[PDB]
């Protein structure tokens, strides 16, 4: 059905997924939680933070459960930040270890595969989240943390991607293929390799428009491939609004973690000590 | 109305109820939470006592936002322990600051103060907790901590909080029967058996006063005697957690070294702790 080195590329990248994909967060610890107890600069970015409303549920070993419901708009909007930047960044360590394991991403010049990881970290991050959405309950299921939201809210892209991407109901090995064609994107600012890595990405693109057509006879999934391309180009852009109203809220109140930092702009790789290091060190 | 001594009996409870009664408990911080994370006899009693009152935690914030705990079901039923004992421990200090400032009490020997709060400690502050009692909601309201009921009234200790509750009885009231139930005589290790007697009866006749005094005459002509009856079923109940308190620290260690005095783990050689609460 699938050329020898289509099956090949598709098991690399499920076996990556497999071995950076903490899907139960069970070592995700030691994040912060909220406590027990200039006009348009604050008010722009109070307006999209309430469609991403969501209530926090910590269950435990022994069967206990933590519900942490959040304030009502009214400084009390950023009080989940510090848990999500915690969070982002737990997810972006699984990421750049994704990154890792696929052998055509080693073999790039160190400076891109920061300059990869740099602009498809926000996309990978809610690809990865997507598989832990539910849509019937509105919430993200990440094993032990579990994160609830609170019409309207579909106005609101980033929710909109999550409804729209879920309906589709894709494999993981169509959900994995999406991750490498967006971590392959040749024109990401920095790259040098922009043949290279354009060669890499229309190989990953062709691999999953031939695994749809041997595995989706159902007319449900007309037109699949061209759907996940349009859903990608839309992440994208997405991803440009949601890391530029980020810096806002960064700028007013400060709550990206080290790593959140060089990802933001806050020698290329110099000024990326950590995501150089966590390059280097091995899975 | 009452007696010029009897008024003075009640002003100067109703002050030590006001002077040691944080109601809104603004003062009960730095207090330890349930983690996000033979001897088969003696876990047989364990489990039998937890499960008999499970309840859950909410926590209200400053802000606005609430966070709410949900116990486990049946080294599990052992996760609200030290929080409660952060709980008691805090409220059985106001129970003896509350006696320190009773003319009546600082004039008892050390020892007898000592015997006193060791029998009446669980008894005023279950007391105290009946104050904070939502019987609608079934939650104790201590201010931003609240303590919601898991779906009872078989507990003897859960009717206690519904019948005294059901009584709706004044502030004074329920300083009265604080007296009562701290200056009974007949508590382990009491030596002035008469004196602590003479002083209980005057609580008493000073309860049954108020009462004929503020109350219509025929509709509570037997509330004292179910004052009464509601204190001696409590001293049941004293006996009964105590010991089941006892069991549960044997297999799993929890009290805090002034609750370990409080429960037997020269009488103010044992009671150090007690002891050096009582002379500041
Ligand atoms: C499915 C979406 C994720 C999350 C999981 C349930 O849903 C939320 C729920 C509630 C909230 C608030 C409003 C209550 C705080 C926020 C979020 N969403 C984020 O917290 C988030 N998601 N991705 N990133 C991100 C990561 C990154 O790389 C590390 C770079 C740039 C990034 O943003 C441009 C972030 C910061
Ligand atoms: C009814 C109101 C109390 C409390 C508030 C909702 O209800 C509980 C709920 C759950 C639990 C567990 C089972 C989940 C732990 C326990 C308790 N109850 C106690 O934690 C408690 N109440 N009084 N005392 C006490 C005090 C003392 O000196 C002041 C001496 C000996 C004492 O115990 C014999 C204690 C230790």
Same mark, same amino acid.
């Given at each position: 059905?699938?050329?020898?080195?289509?099956?090949?590329?598709?098991?690399?990248?499920?076996?990556? =997924?497999?071995?950076?994909?903490?899907?139960?967060?069970?070592?995700?610890?030691?994040?912060?939680?909220?406590?027990?107890?200039?006009?348009?600069?604050?008010?722009?970015?109070?307006?999209?933070?309430?469609?991403?409303?969501?209530?926090?549920?910590?269950?435990?070993?022994?069967?206990?459960?933590?519900?942490?419901?959040?304030?009502?708009?009214?400084?009390?909007?950023?009080?989940?930040?510090?848990?999500?930047?915690?969070?982002?960044?737990?997810?972006?360590?699984?990421?750049?270890?994704?990154?890792?394991?696929?052998?055509?991403?080693?073999?790039?010049?160190?400076?891109?595969?920061?300059?990869?990881?740099?602009?498809?970290?926000?996309?990978?991050?809610?690809?990865?989240?997507?598989?832990?959405?539910?849509?019937?309950?509105?919430?993200?299921?990440?094993?032990?943390?579990?994160?609830?939201?609170? =019409?309207?809210?579909?106005?609101?892209?980033?929710?909109?991607?999550?409804?729209?991407?879920?309906?589709?109901?894709?494999?993981?090995?169509?959900?994995?293929?999406?991750?490498?064609?967006?971590?392959?994107?040749?024109?990401?600012?920095?790259?040098?390799?922009?043949?290279?890595?354009?060669?890499?990405?229309?190989?990953?693109?062709?691999?999953?428009?031939?695994?749809?057509?041997?595995?989706?006879?159902?007319?449900?999934?007309?037109?699949?491939?061209?759907?996940?391309?349009?859903?990608?180009?839309?992440?994208?852009?997405?991803?440009? =609004?949601?890391?530029?109203?980020?810096?806002?809220?960064?700028?007013?109140?400060?709550?990206?973690?080290?790593?959140?930092?060089?990802?933001?702009?806050?020698?290329?790789?110099?000024?990326?000590?950590?995501?150089?290091?966590?390059?280097?060190?091995?899975?």
């Amino acid at each position: 059905g699938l050329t020898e080195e289509q099956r090949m590329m598709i098991r690399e990248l499920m076996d990556a =997924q497999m071995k950076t994909f903490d899907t139960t967060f069970s070592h995700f610890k030691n994040f912060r939680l909220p406590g027990v107890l200039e006009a348009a600069k604050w008010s722009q970015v109070r307006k999209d933070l309430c469609s991403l409303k969501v209530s926090l549920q910590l269950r435990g070993e022994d069967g206990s459960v933590w519900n942490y419901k959040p304030p009502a708009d009214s400084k009390e909007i950023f009080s989940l930040l510090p848990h999500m930047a915690d969070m982002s960044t737990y997810m972006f360590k699984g990421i750049i270890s994704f990154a890792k394991v696929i052998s055509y991403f080693r073999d790039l010049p160190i400076e891109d595969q920061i300059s990869l990881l740099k602009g498809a970290a926000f996309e990978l991050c809610q690809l990865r989240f997507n598989t832990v959405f539910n849509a019937e309950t509105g919430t993200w299921e990440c094993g032990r943390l579990s994160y609830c939201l609170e =019409q309207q809210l579909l106005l609101e892209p980033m929710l909109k991607f999550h409804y729209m991407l879920k309906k589709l109901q894709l494999h993981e090995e169509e959900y994995v293929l999406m991750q490498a064609i967006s971590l392959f994107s040749p024109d990401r600012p920095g790259v040098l390799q922009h043949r290279v890595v354009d060669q890499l990405q229309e190989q990953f693109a062709i691999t999953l428009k031939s695994y749809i057509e041997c595995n989706r006879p159902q007319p449900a999934h007309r037109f699949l491939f061209l759907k996940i391309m349009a859903m990608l180009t839309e992440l994208r852009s997405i991803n440009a =609004q949601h890391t530029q109203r980020l810096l806002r809220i960064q700028d007013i109140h400060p709550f990206a973690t080290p790593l959140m930092q060089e990802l933001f702009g806050i020698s290329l790789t110099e000024r990326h000590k950590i995501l150089h290091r966590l390059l280097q060190e091995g899975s």
